[PDB]
């Protein structure tokens, strides 16, 4: 029923643009929308990846490896799955393993890779693949993992037990001003509700 009629640039930055979207509503009437897009998306199947990294080690409870970074759009520190944009010509799997190593030091193994999923579809066209990766924490490669942050990346690694994820996030949010990411919170909620 509905479709895009036109997309008019309002303002293009170096990384993000705002567009005026004209579309057809399902009563055959024309409406507009204000749309955000990134300027960085080429032929990638999505803008980015987020990595669900399951750290597995003998005689440990499985942990979910999270990162804490300052996020200038938020004006504050945020707790998130490891994530980054997919480089031109890079596969979502390659992006995920690379980002995970850059941000956490860990060398993972791919488990699964989602289709492109929308970040905030009432606002932007931004998409990611959500990639599940297991980390063999008994491998010597992963013994004392050192992050390799790129320029202007400053990331702290926080591993929390899967079996208590939501409570452990609640405890961190209680102890300081930080925001938990909605996908991390959603995943912790489902772990509770299962």
Ligand X SMILES: Cc1nsc(N2CCO[C@@H](C)[C@H]2C)n1
Binding-site residue numbers for substrate are 15, 33-34, 38, 71, 85, 120
Dig out the tokens for 11 from the structure.
């303002």
Q: Which of 11, 15, 193, 194 binds ligand X (CB under 6 A)?
A: 15
Q: Is residue 33 at the binding interface for ligand X, with CB under 6 A as the rule? A: yes
Q: Is residue 11 at the binding interface for a second copy, with CB under 8 A as the rule? A: yes
Asked if residue 130 lies in contact with residue 42, where contact means CB atoms within 8 angstroms, the answer is no
Smallest separation (angstroms) from ligand X to the CB of 51: 16
Q: How far apart are CA 31 and CA 72, in angstroms?
A: 32
Q: Is residue 99 at the binding interface for Mg ion, with CB under 5 A as the rule? A: yes
Q: How far apart are CA 110 and CA 133, in angstroms?
A: 5
Interface of this chain with ligand X, residues 79 to 118, rule: CB under 6 A: none
Which residues, 6+ apart, have CB-to-CB distance to 178 below 8 Å? 68, 76, 77, 78, 79, 172
Closest CB to Mg ion among 57 and 107? 107
Binding-site residue ranges: 15, 33-34, 38, 71, 83, 85, 99, 103, 120, 153
Q: How far apart are CA 145 and CA 127, in angstroms?
A: 29
Comparing CA positions, the residue from 126, 121, 125 lying closest to residue 49 is 126
Q: Which of 68, 71, 87, 157 binds a second copy (CB under 8 A)?
A: 71
Q: Is residue 4 at the binding interface for a second copy, with CB under 8 A as the rule? A: yes
Q: Is residue 84 at the binding interface for Mg ion, with CB under 5 A as the rule? A: yes
> What is the rounded (10 degree) CA torsion for 109, 86, 130, 176?
100
Smallest separation (angstroms) from a second copy to the CB of 140: 26
Closest CB to ligand X among 89 and 152? 152
Asked if residue 176 lies in contact with residue 169, where contact means CB atoms within 8 angstroms, the answer is no
Please count the residues of this chain forming the interface with a second copy, following the rule CB under 8 A: 73
Residues in contact with ligand X by CB under 6 A are 15-16, 33-34, 123, 152
Residues in contact with Mg ion by CB under 5 A are 83-84, 99, 102-103
């Amino acid at each position: 029923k509905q479709y895009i009629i036109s997309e008019e640039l309002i303002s293009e930055g170096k990384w993000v643009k705002l567009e005026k979207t004209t579309y057809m509503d399902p009563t055959g009437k024309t409406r507009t929308w204000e749309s955000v897009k990134r300027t960085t998306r080429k032929e990638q199947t999505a803008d980015g990846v987020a990595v669900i990294p399951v750290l597995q080690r003998t005689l440990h409870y499985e942990c979910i490896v999270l990162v804490k970074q300052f996020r200038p759009p938020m004006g504050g520190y945020c707790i998130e799955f490891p994530a980054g944009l997919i480089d031109d010509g890079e596969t979502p799997e390659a992006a995920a393993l690379r980002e995970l190593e850059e941000e956490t030091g860990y060398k993972g193994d791919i488990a699964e890779c989602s289709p492109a999923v929308c970040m905030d579809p009432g606002l932007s066209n931004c998409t990611i693949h959500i990639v599940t990766v297991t980390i063999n924490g008994d491998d010597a490669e992963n013994a004392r993992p050192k992050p390799k942050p790129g320029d202007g990346e400053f990331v702290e690694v926080i591993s929390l037990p899967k079996n208590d994820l939501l409570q452990r996030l609640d405890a961190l949010v209680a102890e300081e001003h930080l925001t938990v990411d909605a996908r991390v919170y959603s995943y912790a909620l489902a772990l509770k509700h299962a």
